[PDB]
Scaffold this active site. Structure first.
Site, PDB file in Angstrom:
ATOM      1  N   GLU A 176     -26.086  22.675  45.268  1.00  0.00           N
ATOM      2  CA  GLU A 176     -24.979  22.064  44.512  1.00  0.00           C
ATOM      3  C   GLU A 176     -23.940  23.118  44.122  1.00  0.00           C
ATOM      4  O   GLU A 176     -23.446  23.169  42.976  1.00  0.00           O
ATOM      5  CB  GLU A 176     -25.484  21.260  43.301  1.00  0.00           C
ATOM      6  CG  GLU A 176     -26.114  19.938  43.731  1.00  0.00           C
ATOM      7  CD  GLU A 176     -26.227  18.937  42.602  1.00  0.00           C
ATOM      8  OE1 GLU A 176     -25.310  18.889  41.756  1.00  0.00           O
ATOM      9  OE2 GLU A 176     -27.224  18.187  42.567  1.00  0.00           O
ATOM     10  N   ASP A 321     -34.057  22.245  46.586  1.00  0.00           N
ATOM     11  CA  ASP A 321     -34.236  21.099  45.706  1.00  0.00           C
ATOM     12  C   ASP A 321     -34.728  20.025  46.662  1.00  0.00           C
ATOM     13  O   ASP A 321     -33.960  19.514  47.477  1.00  0.00           O
ATOM     14  CB  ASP A 321     -32.943  20.753  44.994  1.00  0.00           C
ATOM     15  CG  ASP A 321     -33.052  19.497  44.162  1.00  0.00           C
ATOM     16  OD1 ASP A 321     -34.088  18.784  44.278  1.00  0.00           O
ATOM     17  OD2 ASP A 321     -32.095  19.202  43.423  1.00  0.00           O
ATOM     18  N   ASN A 323     -36.165  17.189  45.888  1.00  0.00           N
ATOM     19  CA  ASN A 323     -36.148  15.833  45.279  1.00  0.00           C
ATOM     20  C   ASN A 323     -37.504  15.118  45.487  1.00  0.00           C
ATOM     21  O   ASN A 323     -37.551  13.898  45.699  1.00  0.00           O
ATOM     22  CB  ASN A 323     -34.994  15.020  45.900  1.00  0.00           C
ATOM     23  CG  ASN A 323     -33.696  15.272  45.182  1.00  0.00           C
ATOM     24  OD1 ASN A 323     -33.612  15.071  43.973  1.00  0.00           O
ATOM     25  ND2 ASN A 323     -32.628  15.621  45.911  1.00  0.00           N
TER      26      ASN A 323
HETATM   27 MG   LIG Z   1     -27.859  17.076  41.012  1.00  0.00          MG
END
Ligand SMILES: [Mg+2]
Length: 434
Positions: A176, A321, A323
């Site tokens: 991000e 990440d 998720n």
């Molecule tokens: Mg996020």
């Protein structure tokens, strides 16, 4: 001649937070350049008189005594043989008080210095993109508990710069990352502390990997989009073949924009040592378990190709990440090397997108920071979503930098906060070559 093509100071300067100027140098080097920092002689002198500080380094960390003063940087570009024309830049803002405490302050006691040659200090961190954090929905629905000023990009970047530079890390994998955050915040801060970086954007944000130049050089890059690799690369033909009886699941996987960043580094400390560093941000939807399994299967096949076919068998670090919490099919697949055809995540989004299949891989991967209670903590959700996966054939965990305490995480209900610049928590661990 040596010349600064870009010379810029941050807009927000806080006491106890490093001021990392953007310096893009042509025909020269920062080690060969001259730096001198000044502070206003008195508050409100309107920059009429300047007091030399004893700081002759690129980075300046203001003290509490500097609050209310503007700063000025003098810099002379050099190439080791000659100097170019000197430049000076004044801050437009005065030094301000920063937050009283940050969650990473205690964590920095575990990362006091750059590690010895036998170690690799590795970070994985989803730093929360301004493309998402800037919206009214983020401010009022996702993070209403957070002070609005603490969501603002300039504030969060100051904390992220202090946090990351304070880790004195060797490999930093980020998710991000906004395009301007990479070029205007991370590159100036991290290059000042001896790291170089590479960026792989999706639309408005993406992935970055930074590596310490005193320990590593970049050999090559092998980034992919999972949809492109799966549909067009014959390397993934067997997996594409497993998806032929499941056209609805295949279409949803191929729609995703998720990317994988892969960088092969060479140890400047041991000529025989190369390492493949992979970084990703997998599809986020809570019902996307089958999508994350297929993305992970592509990622591992791609990393196997890079590390064992392109290169003749080099070890792997896989940050990201993901998720995915530790109870998922994706996590089981990574750690155990297989997932059964009957796993419940193959129908994570209902029958229409059901895609039962058996998958196998031969990597021996361990979550370096284990399975924390959570790496993401927001209003309405918490979970362990981030991992530093390490190749057990060549690497071992020397130490895990502990995550902030639950009291620290919940001081301002959840994350982000005035003391924590993301909705995720950075993973930091020291790895040792076997
Ligand atoms: Mg996020």
């Amino acid at each position: 001649p040596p010349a600064f093509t870009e010379l810029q100071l941050p807009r927000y300067i806080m006491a106890g937070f490093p001021v990392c100027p953007k310096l893009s140098l042509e025909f020269g080097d920062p080690a060969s350049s001259l730096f001198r920092w000044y502070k206003e002689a008195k508050p409100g002198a309107a920059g009429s008189s300047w007091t030399e500080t004893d700081v002759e380094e690129r980075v300046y960390t203001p003290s509490n005594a500097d609050i209310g003063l503007r700063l000025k940087l003098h810099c002379t570009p050099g190439d080791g043989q000659r100097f170019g024309h000197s430049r000076e830049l004044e801050s437009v803002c005065v030094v301000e008080a920063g937050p009283g405490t940050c969650t990473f302050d205690h964590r920095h006691l575990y990362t006091k210095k750059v590690t010895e040659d036998a170690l690799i200090r590795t970070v994985s961190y989803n730093i929360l993109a301004d493309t998402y954090a800037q919206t009214e929905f983020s401010r009022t629905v996702l993070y209403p508990y957070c002070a609005p000023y603490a969501l603002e990009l300039d504030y969060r970047q100051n904390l992220i710069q202090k946090e990351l530079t304070g880790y004195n890390a060797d490999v930093i994998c980020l998710q991000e990352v906004d395009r301007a955050v990479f070029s205007d915040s991370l590159v100036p801060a991290l290059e000042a502390f001896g790291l170089e970086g590479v960026f792989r954007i999706k639309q408005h944000e993406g992935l970055a990997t930074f590596y310490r130049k005193s320990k590593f050089s970049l050999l090559s890059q092998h980034d992919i989009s999972f949809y492109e690799a799966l549909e067009s690369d014959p390397l993934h033909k067997e997996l594409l073949e497993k998806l032929v009886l499941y056209p609805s699941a295949q279409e949803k996987v191929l729609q995703r924009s998720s990317v994988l960043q892969v960088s092969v580094l060479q140890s400047t400390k041991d000529s025989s040592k190369r390492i493949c560093v992979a970084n990703t941000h997998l599809y986020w939807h809570p019902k996307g378990g089958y999508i994350r399994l297929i993305q992970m299967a592509v990622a591992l096949a791609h990393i196997r190709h890079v590390s064992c076919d392109l290169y003749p068998g080099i070890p792997v670090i896989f940050c990201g990440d993901f998720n995915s919490t530790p109870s998922t099919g994706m996590y089981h697949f990574v750690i155990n090397g297989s997932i059964p055809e009957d796993h419940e995540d193959w129908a994570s989004n209902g029958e229409e997108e059901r895609c039962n299949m058996s998958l196998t891989h031969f990597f021996k991967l361990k979550s370096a920071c284990g399975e924390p209670a959570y790496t993401n903590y927001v209003g309405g959700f918490h979970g362990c979503l981030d991992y530093i996966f390490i190749d057990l054939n060549a690497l071992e965990v020397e130490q895990v930098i502990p995550l902030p305490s639950h009291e620290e995480v919940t001081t301002h209900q959840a994350l982000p906060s005035v003391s924590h610049p993301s909705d995720h928590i950075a993973l930091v661990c020291d790895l040792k070559w076997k």
